Design a binder for this molecule. Sequence first.
Ligand SMILES: [Cl-]
Ligand SMILES: [Cl-]
Ligand SMILES: [Cl-]
Ligand SMILES: [Cl-]
Ligand SMILES: [Cl-]
Ligand SMILES: [Cl-]
Ligand SMILES: [Mg+2]
Ligand SMILES: [Mg+2]
Ligand SMILES: [Mg+2]
Ligand SMILES: [Mg+2]
Lengths: 401, 401, 401, 401
Amino acid sequence: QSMTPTIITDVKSFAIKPDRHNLVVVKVETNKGISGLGCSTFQFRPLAVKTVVDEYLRPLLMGRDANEIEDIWQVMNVNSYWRNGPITNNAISGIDMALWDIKGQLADMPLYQLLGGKARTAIPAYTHAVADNLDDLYHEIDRFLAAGYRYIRCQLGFYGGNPSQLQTPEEPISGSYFDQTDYMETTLKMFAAIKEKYGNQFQMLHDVHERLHPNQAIQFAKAAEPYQLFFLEDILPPDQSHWLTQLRSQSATPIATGELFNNPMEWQELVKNRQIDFMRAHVSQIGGITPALKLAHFCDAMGVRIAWHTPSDISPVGLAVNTHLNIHLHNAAIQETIELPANTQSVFVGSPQPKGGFFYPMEKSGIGITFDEEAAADFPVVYRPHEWTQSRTPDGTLITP
Amino acid sequence: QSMTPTIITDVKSFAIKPDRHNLVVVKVETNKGISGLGCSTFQFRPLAVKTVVDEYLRPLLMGRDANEIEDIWQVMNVNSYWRNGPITNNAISGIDMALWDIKGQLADMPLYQLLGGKARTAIPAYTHAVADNLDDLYHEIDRFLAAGYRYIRCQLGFYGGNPSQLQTPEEPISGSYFDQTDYMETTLKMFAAIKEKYGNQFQMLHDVHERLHPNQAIQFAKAAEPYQLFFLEDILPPDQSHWLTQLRSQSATPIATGELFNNPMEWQELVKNRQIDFMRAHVSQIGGITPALKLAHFCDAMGVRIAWHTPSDISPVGLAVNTHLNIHLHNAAIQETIELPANTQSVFVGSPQPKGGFFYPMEKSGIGITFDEEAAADFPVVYRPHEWTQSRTPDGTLITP
Amino acid sequence: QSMTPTIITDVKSFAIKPDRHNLVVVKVETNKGISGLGCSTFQFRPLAVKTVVDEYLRPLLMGRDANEIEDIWQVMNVNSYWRNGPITNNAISGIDMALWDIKGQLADMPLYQLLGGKARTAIPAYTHAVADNLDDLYHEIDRFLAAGYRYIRCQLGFYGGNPSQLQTPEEPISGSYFDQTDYMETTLKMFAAIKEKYGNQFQMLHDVHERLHPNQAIQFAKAAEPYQLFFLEDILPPDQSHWLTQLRSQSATPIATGELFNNPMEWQELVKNRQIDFMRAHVSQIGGITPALKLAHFCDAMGVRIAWHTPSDISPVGLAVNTHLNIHLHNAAIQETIELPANTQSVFVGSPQPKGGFFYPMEKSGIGITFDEEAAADFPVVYRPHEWTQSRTPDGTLITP
Amino acid sequence: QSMTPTIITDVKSFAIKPDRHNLVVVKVETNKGISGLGCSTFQFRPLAVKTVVDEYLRPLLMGRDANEIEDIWQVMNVNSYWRNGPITNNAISGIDMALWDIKGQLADMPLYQLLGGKARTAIPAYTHAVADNLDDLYHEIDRFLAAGYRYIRCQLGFYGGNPSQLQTPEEPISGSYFDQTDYMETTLKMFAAIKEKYGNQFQMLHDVHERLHPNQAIQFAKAAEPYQLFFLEDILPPDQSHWLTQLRSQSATPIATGELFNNPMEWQELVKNRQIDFMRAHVSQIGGITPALKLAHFCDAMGVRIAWHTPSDISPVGLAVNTHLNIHLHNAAIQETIELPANTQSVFVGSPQPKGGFFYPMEKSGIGITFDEEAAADFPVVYRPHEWTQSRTPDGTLITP
Ligand SMILES: [Cl-]
Ligand SMILES: [Cl-]
Ligand SMILES: [Cl-]
Ligand SMILES: [Cl-]
Ligand SMILES: [Cl-]
Ligand SMILES: [Cl-]
Ligand SMILES: [Mg+2]
Ligand SMILES: [Mg+2]
Ligand SMILES: [Mg+2]
Ligand SMILES: [Mg+2]
């Protein structure tokens, strides 16, 4: 034959914290001595993801033929009967990505080539500029412009912190407090100042990060329209996305959403009805490369573009996968980038980095990342309280974070 | 590197007629000595497809890097500005399939493995039973049942021929004549007779082949409901598919359509609105494997299944491609089959054949078909008049064929 | 009788290039010595159109009664089973137009009279002003205004060329490059400058030529609204025209589209739902005069107007046909015009030319064009690479051209 | 030139009653000695139609160029500012038809040839079988079957007459009385009896003639479904046609309507939304051939077929026009026929008659009818009370007739 079964002989998970974020990576070993890596990084619940991989997915997968990625994905997806969700899908993602890594290595092709080759020369990147005053923000923007970036996510002010820092009722419920009206006003002030100073030199992005009640979100998105953002992101929480119908009939601000999605019913109608311009799914949250390709193709049919969520809390394996998908998929639009720290580079070898404001194709076979098991051992998970997920308006209402 | 450019060094087309149908196949040669085959078979206009490949696609493609299938597809698709259509897309398909063949060979994987592996053990097949009387029809059905088929397309009577054979006005316009009411009545008689004789032993399919005016189609599809067909196919022509809205609200007969499609606007709303159950696209009519994968994924998002059109007028290259797609795609449902004649097997080596009513995965790297250039030379194109495409009702109205 | 059969005794095609564009014209001869001409001009695939006419339509048509234009159209339209598309329809168009030419000659009436007579005195014309700077653009506009034009298509800048001319990634994929944001900004700058200088002296048109992603198209069309264009054309590619729903609910910019259409499913919903103001079909792309009349009447029912695509790459036969249709149809709005060069006038006699900014009725019987077979012989087809159909944004993405 | 102006030198109208129905015909004379005839027959208000032609259309039209049918139609249509309606449109129709007659004569072509030639060999005809008992109905059906008819409109019982003939309140308001429940029950009894006796030998039609309240109409149409009528006609009055939405979602009975229409807003949504299968417009009620062609093309786009209203109260000029339209239009379905009496044949020469259940193309140039002015003089209009238009249910409610 030209191809024999590739038998899974081990499944391992590694929950580690080299730098600021808890990561989870999965390694699948085979009888051929070809191993694959995958990203299962859900930084807030890494121990729970590890439990799923070690106690449930490993015994399910042992002995199976890794060549059949599609069937294995389908099996994993429904294996616990109840399905979808952030812990469930991250565990599945690590396996699915590792199987694609293995297939690329067997083919001796980088992942983007195995998938059908490139759709572009390189994918544009965007960086993040955030400061509590305009002067410091301009300095960040200036640096990125000199580095070749033509797309920059911009935020003025910080929106969290002790209730002592703003007007609240007495004895406020503990949490991370901000004022929605101050957030909107300050951000519009920022848009106007950046536009006046930089004009067409680059395109702003901005992430509303579900800070607003529905009508506030609609008003804010309308107000963003004159500033010609590349996109305005997450103006509504996932379960109130239908409110976009009112916005879309009166505004042409470009809309991105989806980093929070982990269930197809969150996006099915949005995509079918062209209610968003950019799908921002986090690949591991939707269950890996297998479902990501299908989603990208569904979006493409509707003219919806892709901008996978690629935050600081992603492993270099997940970063590499997004790079391959972005080079291959015709409807990929942009690649979110945050600089990788030194400890992380010590554990993961081969991570892509932007060059002159673009990410170029990665050429090693498979995903292209090597994992140093021994170095990883020095960086166990460390518990974080992440108080920003207890976000409150001044009256003490717990809002979507 | 793990992978160097694969430079296209020739593009050849072969219009041939080994048996009953004019075929067109394309061969792409590379600097690596790896060649790929593709199907461009549009049996009614083979010389026009050959003109497009030889005069336009060859000079466009010479020297390009065959690894970049996605980019090359995008380039070909819009290259003549005006696009879509049966001649345009068949020419593109032959190239696209050949590039996938090359990529599979470079990977040393059969196409279904390169795409992500299998989603099933084997795809069910269906055959065709057609006769002008019930007794002969039963004999065909009996033979197929003994052979292991559980799905059989059934047709009673022939619907064409000289106007002398039915009541028409005097001096009828020349054409292939039939009576729509006789067709409907005879077919319902067939459904009832088969159901009484065979019950649940197999599932019938039936192809209406756009024979009907819209209300007739709706009535006929409703009348088919008690007979539990696997699907009822092409009840409406492509430009009147919106009439399905009336049918779908009052009937649950399973509906298949799409073999005629060669423009995404033919299916976009049908799929988005779940107005069909099975998409029956002819892969070469939609431009090859690249767009077929995207369409299958779009359909999958909506719960629509795939049953690629696989008639007698398809080359063994196109047949092999459908087999790989059917093994790989989770939403593939069934594979239409017609027996391959001896002359064809003389020119094409490696064609898949059903075994016990299923098609199994093909294991040679790439698509898996070898083409005998020398044998092909003995079978030039031969002009056919195909009078059945001049179909008329008794009054002489030219209807969709 | 008052009328005997008109038997088709030959069908000839001529693929020629007198000037800048490959043309295809068809000639139908009859037993009455009355011949007709038709336009089958698809400049990018002229040899393929010729193959269809010579190898397939000629034998189908020989001996038929040319009087029955409607039946012959219906026969041709479905003759290859699969149908629609640019090559298929252009071949059909040449025959259909020639039959109308013959019928007009037998009637001794110009085509517009045969169809029912005029609906206006003369159809307004529009010309094209394009330059890479405002000063040169104003000089073009000034000249057209003095010539009597009240409608002028305006474009500032050129949007194509070597990737060396803009910022791209290294080793850019070959193609014709432009920047969408620069295109939008420069065009809005043009609208504002022309409005300030000329005010109400004439109405601008502008052709977006499917350069934009969907949300960009919507934003750009909204931004065009204050400039009171006669129409804004092709803001979206044909398979993403549904995105107009979002635009139409928030903007009253006049929208034209359809030059790319060659399948009724591209326009059926757009027209039914009044989502466009002007239908810009290219008559030969939709299969000739027979389907053009039906489409114009369907549009008229919905209040949609007609502006047939009449570019430089049309034969004088196609130009004459559009002139007759524009004089006759109540909902015809405007006639796109580009000057005809000398070599072309050497081969075709009788071409209409605008006078004082209008086209007047043509008075010779039939279509009114004579074709010089001998002169045509001096101008064979010459292959063109047309790199503009390989249009890319800076990242290298192949976009709709 | 090939064609000079054709100047209108007189317009005459003739209101006559050769047999059972008041007819109105119009004659347009020209400077060329070519005259045309048109039908303005609105049998209930013939003197009012004559007033419009003689007092208003004649002075408007005198001296105009008859060649410009399209412009003249547009002028007539809006000439009284307020427009549409049965008297307005019938007057316009007579002129429009006469101008087409003139154009056909100038072309030396029968009207169907001038329009583009035939779409079929001959149009099927249907006759009417009506009796107050089944036996007499069967005798009518038997006779028509022997004559070659395959389509027969069937009615059992008569639904009108003195209130003495059914149960009513005392001192009933004068009118023509019937019982809706008796009508529905008797008609379903008829459907069942005919089906049992004749089966597939012919297809029934039935005209509900707006006898029913909306829910009754929906129930009745559903109940007709098993009987496979060619169509069920006028189940609802024109201003309650929207009630079809409920019927269409649960029934596939074929629906025809439109003989009452004289305003495009009556049909615009019905056709656009495919809520009817057959459009039954009375050509003179919609303003003549010019708007009839447009309506037929609009219907064709939507897959709606045409069956022009051709009752006994139509002039032979109107009958001839319908015959030409039915031979030419691809979506024409059937031609209603009632036998022409002897006095009428004395005044009009050239009337078409069905042969073996079909109407064949008419071959004289123009419409093909000659009018005997002298014979017409013997048949002045005679006032009729037409009590059937005062239709009442037993309680005395005046219902749509
Ligand atoms: Cl932000
Ligand atoms: Cl084509
Ligand atoms: Cl069948
Ligand atoms: Cl322009
Ligand atoms: Cl009136
Ligand atoms: Cl009746
Ligand atoms: Mg975000
Ligand atoms: Mg079929
Ligand atoms: Mg254009
Ligand atoms: Mg009626």
